Amino acid sequence: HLVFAFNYTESGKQLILPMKNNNNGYLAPSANSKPFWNPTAPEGAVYQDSINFTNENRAFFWLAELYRDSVVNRFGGDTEEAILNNTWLPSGDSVIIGDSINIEYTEGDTYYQRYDCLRTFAYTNEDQNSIVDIVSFMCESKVNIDGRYDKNRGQVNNLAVSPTNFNLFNPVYSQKNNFFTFRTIDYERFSINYFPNSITVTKEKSLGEDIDTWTNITLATTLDLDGDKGEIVSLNTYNNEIFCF
Protein backbone atom coordinates (compact mmCIF):
# COMPACT_ATOMS: atom_id res chain seq x y z
CA HIS A 1 0.00 0.00 0.00
CA LEU A 2 0.94 3.69 -0.08
CA VAL A 3 1.44 5.60 3.18
CA PHE A 4 1.81 9.36 3.52
CA ALA A 5 1.00 12.13 6.00
CA PHE A 6 -0.65 15.53 5.77
CA ASN A 7 1.62 18.42 6.70
CA TYR A 8 0.84 20.41 9.83
CA THR A 9 -0.92 23.73 9.39
CA GLU A 10 1.10 26.94 9.56
CA SER A 11 -0.24 27.40 13.11
CA GLY A 12 1.10 23.97 14.13
CA LYS A 13 -2.18 22.02 14.09
CA GLN A 14 -2.88 18.73 12.29
CA LEU A 15 -4.51 18.60 8.86
CA ILE A 16 -7.21 15.94 8.62
CA LEU A 17 -9.57 14.48 6.05
CA PRO A 18 -12.62 16.78 5.97
CA MET A 19 -15.85 15.83 7.71
CA LYS A 20 -18.78 15.61 5.31
CA ASN A 21 -21.63 18.05 6.01
CA ASN A 22 -20.02 19.04 9.34
CA ASN A 23 -20.85 15.67 10.94
CA ASN A 24 -18.76 13.26 13.02
CA GLY A 25 -15.80 15.54 13.66
CA TYR A 26 -12.53 14.99 15.45
CA LEU A 27 -12.25 14.59 19.22
CA ALA A 28 -11.65 18.15 20.39
CA PRO A 29 -9.23 18.50 23.33
CA SER A 30 -10.17 20.22 26.56
CA ALA A 31 -8.83 23.65 27.48
CA ASN A 32 -5.08 23.79 28.15
CA SER A 33 -4.67 20.10 27.25
CA LYS A 34 -1.88 19.04 24.88
CA PRO A 35 -1.31 15.74 23.03
CA PHE A 36 1.03 13.36 24.80
CA TRP A 37 3.23 13.17 21.67
CA ASN A 38 3.45 16.97 21.24
CA PRO A 39 3.52 19.02 24.46
CA THR A 40 4.45 22.17 22.50
CA ALA A 41 1.24 22.30 20.47
CA PRO A 42 -1.25 25.14 19.89
CA GLU A 43 -4.68 25.36 21.46
CA GLY A 44 -6.98 22.79 19.87
CA ALA A 45 -4.00 21.25 18.05
CA VAL A 46 -6.33 20.04 15.27
CA TYR A 47 -7.69 21.55 12.05
CA GLN A 48 -10.54 20.00 10.07
CA ASP A 49 -12.68 21.28 7.19
CA SER A 50 -15.99 20.08 5.74
CA ILE A 51 -17.25 19.28 2.24
CA ASN A 52 -20.87 20.15 1.41
CA PHE A 53 -21.64 16.85 -0.32
CA THR A 54 -25.24 15.63 -0.02
CA ASN A 55 -25.46 12.82 -2.60
CA GLU A 56 -23.74 10.46 -0.11
CA ASN A 57 -25.97 9.37 2.78
CA ARG A 58 -24.24 6.14 3.94
CA ALA A 59 -20.82 5.27 5.30
CA PHE A 60 -17.95 5.96 2.91
CA PHE A 61 -14.22 6.22 2.36
CA TRP A 62 -12.84 9.45 0.94
CA LEU A 63 -11.87 8.37 -2.58
CA ALA A 64 -8.78 10.36 -3.54
CA GLU A 65 -6.11 10.77 -6.15
CA LEU A 66 -2.32 11.26 -6.16
CA TYR A 67 -2.24 14.43 -8.23
CA ARG A 68 0.96 15.55 -9.96
CA ASP A 69 1.09 19.17 -11.07
CA SER A 70 4.25 19.76 -13.14
CA VAL A 71 5.24 17.36 -15.92
CA VAL A 72 7.92 18.61 -18.32
CA ASN A 73 8.21 16.87 -21.70
CA ARG A 74 5.22 14.57 -21.29
CA PHE A 75 5.57 12.50 -24.48
CA GLY A 76 9.18 13.51 -25.17
CA GLY A 77 8.20 16.97 -26.42
CA ASP A 78 5.41 18.96 -28.03
CA THR A 79 7.10 19.42 -31.41
CA GLU A 80 6.56 17.31 -34.51
CA GLU A 81 10.16 16.31 -33.79
CA ALA A 82 9.26 14.58 -30.52
CA ILE A 83 6.02 13.21 -31.99
CA LEU A 84 8.09 11.43 -34.64
CA ASN A 85 9.78 9.24 -32.01
CA ASN A 86 6.45 8.30 -30.39
CA THR A 87 4.59 5.03 -30.94
CA TRP A 88 0.86 5.25 -31.66
CA LEU A 89 -1.94 2.74 -31.07
CA PRO A 90 -5.37 2.36 -32.71
CA SER A 91 -8.48 3.43 -30.83
CA GLY A 92 -12.02 2.92 -32.10
CA ASP A 93 -13.76 1.46 -35.12
CA SER A 94 -13.29 2.79 -38.63
CA VAL A 95 -16.02 5.16 -39.86
CA ILE A 96 -16.84 6.31 -43.39
CA ILE A 97 -15.87 9.83 -44.47
CA GLY A 98 -19.18 11.33 -45.57
CA ASP A 99 -20.06 15.02 -45.51
CA SER A 100 -18.28 15.16 -42.13
CA ILE A 101 -15.88 13.05 -40.07
CA ASN A 102 -17.14 11.95 -36.64
CA ILE A 103 -14.60 9.78 -34.78
CA GLU A 104 -15.16 8.22 -31.35
CA TYR A 105 -12.20 6.83 -29.40
CA THR A 106 -13.70 3.70 -27.87
CA GLU A 107 -10.57 1.95 -26.56
CA GLY A 108 -8.49 3.88 -24.03
CA ASP A 109 -6.24 2.64 -21.23
CA THR A 110 -8.30 2.93 -18.00
CA TYR A 111 -10.61 0.29 -16.55
CA TYR A 112 -13.38 0.55 -13.95
CA GLN A 113 -13.64 -2.70 -12.01
CA ARG A 114 -14.39 -4.01 -8.54
CA TYR A 115 -11.26 -4.18 -6.37
CA ASP A 116 -11.19 -6.29 -3.19
CA CYS A 117 -8.29 -4.96 -1.11
CA LEU A 118 -7.19 -7.61 1.40
CA ARG A 119 -5.96 -4.94 3.80
CA THR A 120 -5.18 -7.27 6.71
CA PHE A 121 -4.64 -10.99 7.21
CA ALA A 122 -3.25 -13.37 9.81
CA TYR A 123 0.38 -13.23 10.90
CA THR A 124 0.37 -17.02 11.32
CA ASN A 125 -2.04 -19.94 11.05
CA GLU A 126 -1.73 -20.89 14.75
CA ASP A 127 -1.77 -17.58 16.64
CA GLN A 128 -4.62 -16.76 19.00
CA ASN A 129 -5.95 -13.42 17.71
CA SER A 130 -5.93 -12.65 13.98
CA ILE A 131 -7.99 -10.31 11.81
CA VAL A 132 -9.02 -10.43 8.15
CA ASP A 133 -10.22 -7.16 6.61
CA ILE A 134 -11.38 -6.65 3.01
CA VAL A 135 -12.80 -3.58 1.25
CA SER A 136 -14.60 -4.35 -2.02
CA PHE A 137 -15.14 -1.19 -4.05
CA MET A 138 -15.12 0.08 -7.63
CA CYS A 139 -12.09 2.04 -8.82
CA GLU A 140 -10.28 3.28 -11.91
CA SER A 141 -7.04 1.52 -12.84
CA LYS A 142 -4.70 0.89 -15.75
CA VAL A 143 -4.56 -2.83 -14.85
CA ASN A 144 -7.35 -5.25 -15.71
CA ILE A 145 -8.50 -6.02 -12.17
CA ASP A 146 -11.02 -8.55 -13.50
CA GLY A 147 -8.14 -10.83 -14.49
CA ARG A 148 -8.11 -12.19 -10.94
CA TYR A 149 -8.39 -15.94 -11.49
CA ASP A 150 -8.95 -17.19 -7.92
CA LYS A 151 -12.38 -18.29 -6.74
CA ASN A 152 -12.20 -16.74 -3.23
CA ARG A 153 -14.22 -13.70 -4.34
CA GLY A 154 -17.36 -12.38 -2.69
CA GLN A 155 -17.69 -15.12 -0.07
CA VAL A 156 -18.89 -14.45 3.47
CA ASN A 157 -16.32 -16.78 5.07
CA ASN A 158 -13.06 -15.00 4.09
CA LEU A 159 -11.38 -16.78 7.01
CA ALA A 160 -8.37 -18.49 5.41
CA VAL A 161 -7.72 -15.85 2.73
CA SER A 162 -4.18 -14.56 2.32
CA PRO A 163 -1.93 -13.12 -0.43
CA THR A 164 -1.47 -16.75 -1.51
CA ASN A 165 -5.20 -17.29 -2.17
CA PHE A 166 -7.15 -14.04 -2.41
CA ASN A 167 -5.69 -11.82 -5.16
CA LEU A 168 -3.93 -14.08 -7.63
CA PHE A 169 -3.62 -12.20 -10.91
CA ASN A 170 -3.21 -13.05 -14.61
CA PRO A 171 -1.44 -10.06 -16.24
CA VAL A 172 -2.20 -11.12 -19.83
CA TYR A 173 -5.66 -9.56 -19.89
CA SER A 174 -4.13 -6.07 -19.46
CA GLN A 175 -2.90 -6.02 -23.06
CA LYS A 176 -3.00 -3.07 -25.46
CA ASN A 177 -3.38 -2.85 -29.25
CA ASN A 178 0.34 -3.45 -29.55
CA PHE A 179 0.29 -5.73 -32.61
CA PHE A 180 -0.79 -3.09 -35.16
CA THR A 181 1.07 0.10 -34.22
CA PHE A 182 1.77 3.16 -36.37
CA ARG A 183 3.73 6.41 -36.18
CA THR A 184 4.02 9.83 -37.79
CA ILE A 185 6.04 10.46 -40.96
CA ASP A 186 7.87 13.66 -41.91
CA TYR A 187 6.91 15.08 -45.30
CA GLU A 188 10.06 17.06 -46.10
CA ARG A 189 12.48 14.32 -44.99
CA PHE A 190 14.15 12.62 -47.96
CA SER A 191 13.76 8.83 -47.78
CA ILE A 192 14.41 7.25 -51.15
CA ASN A 193 11.81 5.15 -52.96
CA TYR A 194 13.62 4.47 -56.27
CA PHE A 195 15.81 1.39 -56.85
CA PRO A 196 17.23 1.44 -60.40
CA ASN A 197 19.46 -1.56 -59.58
CA SER A 198 17.10 -3.97 -57.83
CA ILE A 199 15.05 -7.03 -58.80
CA THR A 200 12.25 -8.38 -56.62
CA VAL A 201 11.30 -12.05 -56.93
CA THR A 202 7.88 -13.45 -56.06
CA LYS A 203 7.03 -16.96 -54.89
CA GLU A 204 6.56 -19.85 -57.29
CA LYS A 205 2.93 -19.88 -58.41
CA SER A 206 1.25 -22.60 -56.36
CA LEU A 207 -1.52 -23.07 -58.95
CA GLY A 208 -3.67 -24.29 -56.07
CA GLU A 209 -6.70 -22.86 -54.32
CA ASP A 210 -4.99 -19.79 -52.89
CA ILE A 211 -3.99 -16.25 -53.94
CA ASP A 212 -1.94 -15.35 -57.00
CA THR A 213 1.64 -15.17 -55.75
CA TRP A 214 2.62 -12.69 -58.47
CA THR A 215 0.26 -9.97 -57.23
CA ASN A 216 1.66 -10.29 -53.68
CA ILE A 217 4.98 -8.42 -53.58
CA THR A 218 6.81 -8.45 -50.24
CA LEU A 219 10.33 -7.36 -51.30
CA ALA A 220 11.69 -10.22 -49.19
CA THR A 221 13.75 -11.73 -52.06
CA THR A 222 15.38 -8.71 -53.66
CA LEU A 223 18.57 -8.77 -55.73
CA ASP A 224 20.70 -5.71 -56.48
CA LEU A 225 23.01 -5.39 -59.47
CA ASP A 226 26.10 -3.20 -59.72
CA GLY A 227 25.29 0.50 -59.82
CA ASP A 228 28.38 1.55 -61.79
CA LYS A 229 27.04 -0.07 -65.02
CA GLY A 230 23.61 1.57 -65.10
CA GLU A 231 19.94 1.07 -64.42
CA ILE A 232 18.20 -2.20 -65.29
CA VAL A 233 17.19 -1.43 -68.87
CA SER A 234 15.56 -4.78 -69.61
CA LEU A 235 15.01 -8.28 -68.25
CA ASN A 236 14.62 -11.22 -70.63
CA THR A 237 14.57 -15.02 -70.60
CA TYR A 238 16.22 -17.31 -73.13
CA ASN A 239 16.40 -21.12 -72.87
CA ASN A 240 15.60 -21.56 -69.18
CA GLU A 241 17.85 -18.65 -68.10
CA ILE A 242 17.07 -15.06 -67.15
CA PHE A 243 19.32 -12.41 -68.71
CA CYS A 244 19.31 -8.79 -67.53
CA PHE A 245 20.36 -5.88 -69.74
Binding site: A59, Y67, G92, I103, F195, T213, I232
Partner: protein, 294 residues
Protein backbone atom coordinates in the same frame (compact mmCIF):
# COMPACT_ATOMS: atom_id res chain seq x y z
CA UNK B 1 5.67 -0.78 -56.78
CA UNK B 2 6.19 0.79 -60.20
CA UNK B 3 8.51 -1.68 -61.99
CA UNK B 4 10.04 -1.23 -65.44
CA UNK B 5 10.53 -4.76 -66.85
CA UNK B 6 9.52 -8.35 -66.16
CA UNK B 7 10.44 -11.94 -66.96
CA UNK B 8 8.83 -15.28 -66.15
CA UNK B 9 10.88 -18.38 -65.29
CA UNK B 10 9.62 -21.47 -63.46
CA UNK B 11 6.30 -19.81 -62.60
CA UNK B 12 8.16 -16.99 -60.81
CA UNK B 13 7.89 -13.30 -61.69
CA UNK B 14 10.83 -10.87 -61.72
CA UNK B 15 10.40 -7.10 -61.45
CA UNK B 16 13.37 -4.80 -62.07
CA UNK B 17 13.98 -1.05 -61.75
CA UNK B 18 11.01 -0.38 -59.48
CA UNK B 19 9.84 2.64 -57.49
CA UNK B 20 8.03 2.18 -54.18
CA UNK B 21 4.97 4.35 -54.73
CA UNK B 22 4.56 5.98 -51.32
CA UNK B 23 1.64 8.40 -50.87
CA UNK B 24 2.04 10.95 -48.07
CA UNK B 25 -0.06 13.81 -46.70
CA UNK B 26 1.30 17.32 -47.20
CA UNK B 27 2.19 19.41 -44.16
CA UNK B 28 -0.35 22.12 -44.99
CA UNK B 29 -3.15 19.55 -45.11
CA UNK B 30 -1.97 18.07 -41.81
CA UNK B 31 -2.10 21.53 -40.21
CA UNK B 32 -5.52 22.18 -41.75
CA UNK B 33 -6.84 18.92 -40.28
CA UNK B 34 -5.32 19.86 -36.92
CA UNK B 35 -7.02 23.27 -36.99
CA UNK B 36 -10.37 21.91 -38.22
CA UNK B 37 -10.59 19.21 -35.52
CA UNK B 38 -13.37 19.94 -33.02
CA UNK B 39 -12.45 17.44 -30.30
CA UNK B 40 -14.80 16.90 -27.36
CA UNK B 41 -15.21 14.39 -24.54
CA UNK B 42 -18.49 12.48 -24.26
CA UNK B 43 -19.97 9.97 -21.80
CA UNK B 44 -20.67 6.90 -23.92
CA UNK B 45 -21.36 3.28 -23.08
CA UNK B 46 -21.65 -0.21 -24.51
CA UNK B 47 -24.21 -1.40 -27.04
CA UNK B 48 -26.18 -3.28 -24.37
CA UNK B 49 -26.22 -0.23 -22.04
CA UNK B 50 -28.05 -2.18 -19.28
CA UNK B 51 -26.28 -4.68 -16.99
CA UNK B 52 -29.21 -6.69 -15.65
CA UNK B 53 -26.87 -9.24 -14.04
CA UNK B 54 -26.27 -6.90 -11.08
CA UNK B 55 -28.99 -6.09 -8.54
CA UNK B 56 -29.30 -4.79 -4.98
CA UNK B 57 -31.05 -8.02 -3.91
CA UNK B 58 -27.78 -9.86 -3.22
CA UNK B 59 -24.91 -9.75 -0.76
CA UNK B 60 -22.22 -9.31 -3.42
CA UNK B 61 -22.21 -8.81 -7.20
CA UNK B 62 -18.82 -8.72 -8.90
CA UNK B 63 -18.95 -6.28 -11.82
CA UNK B 64 -17.32 -8.48 -14.47
CA UNK B 65 -16.37 -6.73 -17.72
CA UNK B 66 -14.45 -9.52 -19.49
CA UNK B 67 -17.56 -10.87 -21.24
CA UNK B 68 -17.48 -7.78 -23.52
CA UNK B 69 -14.95 -6.46 -26.03
CA UNK B 70 -11.88 -4.38 -25.12
CA UNK B 71 -13.91 -1.19 -25.68
CA UNK B 72 -14.58 -1.23 -21.91
CA UNK B 73 -11.43 0.89 -21.57
CA UNK B 74 -11.98 4.56 -20.78
CA UNK B 75 -9.91 7.68 -20.12
CA UNK B 76 -8.80 9.09 -16.78
CA UNK B 77 -10.51 12.41 -16.14
CA UNK B 78 -7.41 14.47 -15.33
CA UNK B 79 -5.02 12.78 -17.77
CA UNK B 80 -3.43 14.22 -20.90
CA UNK B 81 -3.72 12.09 -24.05
CA UNK B 82 -1.93 12.78 -27.34
CA UNK B 83 -4.62 12.18 -29.96
CA UNK B 84 -4.55 11.56 -33.69
CA UNK B 85 -6.53 10.32 -36.67
CA UNK B 86 -5.91 7.85 -39.49
CA UNK B 87 -7.35 7.28 -42.96
CA UNK B 88 -7.96 4.11 -44.97
CA UNK B 89 -7.39 3.71 -48.70
CA UNK B 90 -9.66 1.77 -51.06
CA UNK B 91 -7.55 -1.34 -50.33
CA UNK B 92 -7.58 -1.25 -46.52
CA UNK B 93 -4.11 0.30 -46.20
CA UNK B 94 -4.01 2.69 -43.25
CA UNK B 95 -2.24 6.00 -43.82
CA UNK B 96 0.08 7.67 -41.33
CA UNK B 97 -1.23 9.48 -38.24
CA UNK B 98 -2.23 13.16 -38.21
CA UNK B 99 -1.33 14.60 -34.81
CA UNK B 100 -4.22 16.83 -33.73
CA UNK B 101 -3.11 17.88 -30.23
CA UNK B 102 -2.80 16.82 -26.60
CA UNK B 103 -6.28 17.03 -25.07
CA UNK B 104 -7.34 16.49 -21.46
CA UNK B 105 -10.38 14.45 -20.48
CA UNK B 106 -13.23 16.17 -18.65
CA UNK B 107 -15.73 13.42 -17.66
CA UNK B 108 -15.15 10.63 -15.15
CA UNK B 109 -16.55 7.12 -15.00
CA UNK B 110 -20.01 6.74 -13.49
CA UNK B 111 -21.59 3.54 -12.15
CA UNK B 112 -25.12 3.87 -10.75
CA UNK B 113 -26.61 0.76 -9.13
CA UNK B 114 -30.38 0.77 -9.59
CA UNK B 115 -32.72 -1.79 -8.04
CA UNK B 116 -32.55 -4.43 -10.80
CA UNK B 117 -29.65 -3.25 -12.99
CA UNK B 118 -26.60 -1.03 -13.16
CA UNK B 119 -25.50 1.56 -15.70
CA UNK B 120 -21.82 2.26 -16.42
CA UNK B 121 -20.71 5.25 -18.51
CA UNK B 122 -17.31 5.15 -20.21
CA UNK B 123 -15.67 8.50 -21.08
CA UNK B 124 -14.71 8.70 -24.76
CA UNK B 125 -13.11 11.37 -26.90
CA UNK B 126 -14.91 12.52 -30.04
CA UNK B 127 -13.28 14.34 -32.96
CA UNK B 128 -15.58 16.23 -35.34
CA UNK B 129 -14.38 17.68 -38.65
CA UNK B 130 -16.96 19.54 -40.75
CA UNK B 131 -14.86 21.80 -43.01
CA UNK B 132 -16.04 20.53 -46.40
CA UNK B 133 -12.85 21.76 -48.07
CA UNK B 134 -10.69 19.61 -45.80
CA UNK B 135 -12.95 16.58 -46.23
CA UNK B 136 -12.91 16.94 -50.01
CA UNK B 137 -9.12 17.28 -49.95
CA UNK B 138 -8.90 14.09 -47.89
CA UNK B 139 -11.23 12.28 -50.30
CA UNK B 140 -9.19 13.44 -53.30
CA UNK B 141 -6.20 11.57 -51.83
CA UNK B 142 -8.11 8.30 -52.26
CA UNK B 143 -9.12 7.91 -48.61
CA UNK B 144 -12.54 6.55 -47.65
CA UNK B 145 -12.58 5.63 -43.95
CA UNK B 146 -10.99 7.10 -40.84
CA UNK B 147 -10.13 5.86 -37.36
CA UNK B 148 -9.03 7.21 -34.00
CA UNK B 149 -5.39 6.83 -32.96
CA UNK B 150 -3.88 7.70 -29.57
CA UNK B 151 -0.57 7.70 -27.72
CA UNK B 152 -1.18 6.66 -24.14
CA UNK B 153 0.90 8.24 -21.35
CA UNK B 154 3.71 6.42 -19.60
CA UNK B 155 4.04 6.16 -15.82
CA UNK B 156 6.72 8.86 -15.76
CA UNK B 157 4.60 11.45 -17.61
CA UNK B 158 1.28 10.47 -16.00
CA UNK B 159 -0.62 13.21 -14.20
CA UNK B 160 -2.43 10.56 -12.15
CA UNK B 161 -0.36 7.97 -10.32
CA UNK B 162 -3.23 5.92 -8.87
CA UNK B 163 -6.72 6.08 -7.38
CA UNK B 164 -7.88 4.46 -4.16
CA UNK B 165 -9.64 4.78 -0.84
CA UNK B 166 -8.21 6.52 2.23
CA UNK B 167 -8.02 4.49 5.44
CA UNK B 168 -7.19 6.03 8.84
CA UNK B 169 -4.24 4.58 10.73
CA UNK B 170 -3.82 3.73 14.42
CA UNK B 171 -1.07 4.22 16.98
CA UNK B 172 -0.38 2.87 20.47
CA UNK B 173 0.18 5.41 23.23
CA UNK B 174 3.40 3.94 24.61
CA UNK B 175 4.87 3.19 21.18
CA UNK B 176 3.94 6.66 19.92
CA UNK B 177 5.74 8.22 22.88
CA UNK B 178 8.65 5.86 22.21
CA UNK B 179 8.33 6.41 18.44
CA UNK B 180 9.37 2.80 17.82
CA UNK B 181 6.13 2.69 15.94
CA UNK B 182 4.44 6.05 15.65
CA UNK B 183 1.63 4.86 13.35
CA UNK B 184 0.52 1.54 11.91
CA UNK B 185 -2.07 0.11 9.55
CA UNK B 186 -5.47 -0.25 11.20
CA UNK B 187 -6.39 -3.90 11.64
CA UNK B 188 -9.98 -2.80 10.94
CA UNK B 189 -10.92 -0.48 8.10
CA UNK B 190 -12.48 2.69 9.50
CA UNK B 191 -14.97 4.44 7.19
CA UNK B 192 -16.57 7.76 8.02
CA UNK B 193 -20.28 7.95 8.81
CA UNK B 194 -22.57 10.26 6.85
CA UNK B 195 -24.73 11.16 9.88
CA UNK B 196 -24.59 11.24 13.69
CA UNK B 197 -27.65 9.06 14.34
CA UNK B 198 -25.42 6.10 15.24
CA UNK B 199 -24.47 7.94 18.44
CA UNK B 200 -28.14 7.94 19.44
CA UNK B 201 -28.39 4.31 18.32
CA UNK B 202 -25.68 3.42 20.85
CA UNK B 203 -27.97 4.21 23.78
CA UNK B 204 -30.33 1.89 25.62
CA UNK B 205 -32.09 -0.80 23.59
CA UNK B 206 -31.91 1.13 20.30
CA UNK B 207 -28.86 -0.76 19.00
CA UNK B 208 -29.51 -4.38 18.03
CA UNK B 209 -26.25 -6.27 17.55
CA UNK B 210 -27.47 -7.80 14.28
CA UNK B 211 -26.99 -4.44 12.53
CA UNK B 212 -23.22 -4.50 13.01
CA UNK B 213 -20.77 -2.23 14.80
CA UNK B 214 -19.40 1.01 13.35
CA UNK B 215 -15.64 1.18 14.07
CA UNK B 216 -13.93 3.96 16.00
CA UNK B 217 -13.26 6.29 13.06
CA UNK B 218 -12.96 9.74 14.66
CA UNK B 219 -9.50 11.27 14.68
CA UNK B 220 -8.26 11.18 18.30
CA UNK B 221 -11.11 9.02 19.59
CA UNK B 222 -9.53 6.13 21.56
CA UNK B 223 -10.31 2.65 20.26
CA UNK B 224 -12.17 1.58 23.37
CA UNK B 225 -14.45 2.99 26.02
CA UNK B 226 -15.95 2.41 29.46
CA UNK B 227 -19.57 3.10 28.47
CA UNK B 228 -21.52 -0.17 28.30
CA UNK B 229 -23.99 1.55 25.95
CA UNK B 230 -21.39 1.04 23.19
CA UNK B 231 -19.73 -2.11 24.52
CA UNK B 232 -19.87 -3.98 21.20
CA UNK B 233 -17.50 -1.38 19.70
CA UNK B 234 -14.62 -2.51 21.93
CA UNK B 235 -11.76 -3.80 19.76
CA UNK B 236 -9.10 -4.43 22.44
CA UNK B 237 -9.72 -6.05 25.82
CA UNK B 238 -7.01 -4.07 27.65
CA UNK B 239 -8.35 -0.65 26.57
CA UNK B 240 -9.89 1.89 28.96
CA UNK B 241 -10.72 4.69 26.51
CA UNK B 242 -8.05 7.07 27.81
CA UNK B 243 -8.19 10.26 25.73
CA UNK B 244 -4.81 11.20 24.11
CA UNK B 245 -4.83 14.62 25.80
CA UNK B 246 -3.31 15.68 29.11
CA UNK B 247 -2.89 18.91 31.06
CA UNK B 248 0.86 19.72 31.19
CA UNK B 249 0.45 21.54 34.51
CA UNK B 250 -0.82 18.37 36.23
CA UNK B 251 1.03 15.32 34.85
CA UNK B 252 3.91 14.48 32.54
CA UNK B 253 3.53 12.64 29.23
CA UNK B 254 5.07 9.42 30.54
CA UNK B 255 2.97 9.45 33.71
CA UNK B 256 -0.21 10.16 31.74
CA UNK B 257 0.49 7.34 29.27
CA UNK B 258 1.35 4.91 32.08
CA UNK B 259 -2.32 4.89 33.08
CA UNK B 260 -3.06 2.90 29.92
CA UNK B 261 0.09 2.33 27.84
CA UNK B 262 -1.67 -0.38 25.80
CA UNK B 263 -4.27 2.15 24.63
CA UNK B 264 -4.54 2.96 20.92
CA UNK B 265 -5.67 6.13 19.16
CA UNK B 266 -6.96 6.54 15.63
CA UNK B 267 -4.95 8.78 13.31
CA UNK B 268 -6.60 10.47 10.33
CA UNK B 269 -3.61 12.84 10.05
CA UNK B 270 -1.56 9.89 8.72
CA UNK B 271 -3.38 7.70 6.21
CA UNK B 272 -2.80 4.61 4.04
CA UNK B 273 -3.97 4.82 0.43
CA UNK B 274 -5.02 1.43 -1.00
CA UNK B 275 -5.10 1.44 -4.81
CA UNK B 276 -5.28 -1.59 -7.13
CA UNK B 277 -2.24 -0.42 -9.09
CA UNK B 278 0.01 -0.70 -6.03
CA UNK B 279 -1.06 -4.30 -5.43
CA UNK B 280 -1.02 -5.39 -9.08
CA UNK B 281 1.60 -3.14 -10.73
CA UNK B 282 4.95 -3.95 -9.12
CA UNK B 283 6.44 -0.62 -10.25
CA UNK B 284 4.43 1.34 -7.66
CA UNK B 285 5.55 -0.85 -4.73
CA UNK B 286 9.11 0.56 -4.91
CA UNK B 287 8.36 4.29 -4.60
CA UNK B 288 10.62 6.04 -2.08
CA UNK B 289 9.82 9.62 -1.05
CA UNK B 290 7.78 10.52 -4.12
CA UNK B 291 6.68 14.13 -4.51
CA UNK B 292 2.95 14.03 -5.27
CA UNK B 293 -0.18 16.00 -4.39
CA UNK B 294 -3.46 14.62 -3.02
Amino acid sequence: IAPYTMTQKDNTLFLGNYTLKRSLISTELKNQIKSDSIVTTILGGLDDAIESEWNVNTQYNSNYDLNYDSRIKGFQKGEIYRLGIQFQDNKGKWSEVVFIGDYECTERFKYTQYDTYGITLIPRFKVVISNSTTIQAIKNLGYINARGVVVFPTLEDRNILCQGILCPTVANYKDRLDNSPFVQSSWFSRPKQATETWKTEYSGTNHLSEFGEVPYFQHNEPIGSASLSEITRWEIQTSLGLVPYYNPSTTNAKDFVDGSPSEFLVDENIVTMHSPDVEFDDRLQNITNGKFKL
